[PDB]
Ligand binder design. Sequence first.
Ligand SMILES: *C(=O)/C=C/c1ccc(O)cc1
Length: 122
Amino acid sequence: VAFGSEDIENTLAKMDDGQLDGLAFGAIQLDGDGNILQYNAAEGDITSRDPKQVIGKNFFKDVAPCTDSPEFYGKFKEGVASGNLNTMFEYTFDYQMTPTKVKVHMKKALSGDSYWVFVKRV
Ligand SMILES: *C(=O)/C=C/c1ccc(O)cc1
């Protein structure tokens, strides 16, 4: 189970409350509109966020506005509208933080009503 694993959505679907926090890569679960449902420890470290605080906020509007663009937020809504989200790219996170380069992997969750955003430094 690692960043980029071909069946990552299967393994996470079988996880609990804090198992998500044992992952070496940042992991965020969003609903179809971009609202944060889950946000693990690793992501909070990478972006200097307190996980408990970002839950409930909209990822694209409030927490990660730099991701509100055709290549990130744009691809997110396409995958949502096709039931097949599974894309990788590099990006730079800079809102309320020191600009940090990262590799991003977005992928639909098994339920097909929620979506994952995986992150690791590069
Ligand atoms: C761009 O503004 C990105 C900001 C951001 C990305 C990921 C996070 O977990 C927190 C903030």
